[PDB]
Design an enzyme around this catalytic site. Structure first.
Site, PDB file in Angstrom:
ATOM      1  CD  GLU A  11      -0.918  -3.695  -5.539  1.00 34.81           C
ATOM      2  OE1 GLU A  11      -1.144  -4.649  -4.734  1.00 34.81           O
ATOM      3  OE2 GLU A  11      -0.011  -2.892  -5.369  1.00 34.81           O
ATOM      4  CG  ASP A  20       0.003  -5.338   2.559  1.00 30.86           C
ATOM      5  OD1 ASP A  20       0.536  -5.860   3.609  1.00 30.86           O
ATOM      6  OD2 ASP A  20       0.115  -4.175   2.351  1.00 30.86           O
TER       7      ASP A  20
END
Ligand SMILES: [Cl-]
Ligand SMILES: [Cl-]
Ligand SMILES: [Kr]
Ligand SMILES: [Kr]
Length: 162
Positions: A11, A20
């Site tokens: 991440e 994202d």
């Protein structure tokens, strides 16, 4: 290696609101803020999550805090999910971390949809599960990550992360 390090690797760490891979507003270590395309919305949700007027920026500690909460909730979700729990309980330690990673990424619902792979994982048919899970949107959209996770399920070791 552990779950935290593994996910901090997939991440990353970002201290300002970012979008994202799917274009949604997120912050920290993969902490999704909202699916809305409004940044104000994202900022609202962030202040609400943090408890202060962040103005789209948090500290590292705050980020780690969200992450602890998020990992916890992910495990807890698994345990409460009728389709997930038994798979998880049958697995060894390393492989459980691969399942938490997918849940963290896609939500329990999304993971509970890999019916066939889950069953094969349950039967300890590693190669088969790995081939079935790659036939997914998940794998075609984030292939480098998906491969690391699948290798983990397949081998039961951390080699993909070393
Ligand atoms: Cl496919
Ligand atoms: Cl990826
Ligand atoms: Kr899976
Ligand atoms: Kr898998």
């Amino acid at each position: 290696m552990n779950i935290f390090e593994m996910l901090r690797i997939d991440e990353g760490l970002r201290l300002k609101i970012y979008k994202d891979t799917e274009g949604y507003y997120t912050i920290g270590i993969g902490h999704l803020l909202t699916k809305s395309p409004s940044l104000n919305a994202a900022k609202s949700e962030l202040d609400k999550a943090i408890g202060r007027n962040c103005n789209g920026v948090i500290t590292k500690d705050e980020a780690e805090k969200l992450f602890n909460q998020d990992v916890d909730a992910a495990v807890r979700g698994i345990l409460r999910n009728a389709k997930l729990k038994p798979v998880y309980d049958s697995l060894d330690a390393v492989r459980r971390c691969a399942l938490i990673n997918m849940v963290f990424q896609m939500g329990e619902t999304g993971v509970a949809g890999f019916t066939n792979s889950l069953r094969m994982l349950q039967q300890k048919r590693w190669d088969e599960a790995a081939v079935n899970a790659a036939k997914s949107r998940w794998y075609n959209q984030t292939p480098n990550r998906a491969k690391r996770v699948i290798t983990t399920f397949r081998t039961g070791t951390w080699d993909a992360y070393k």
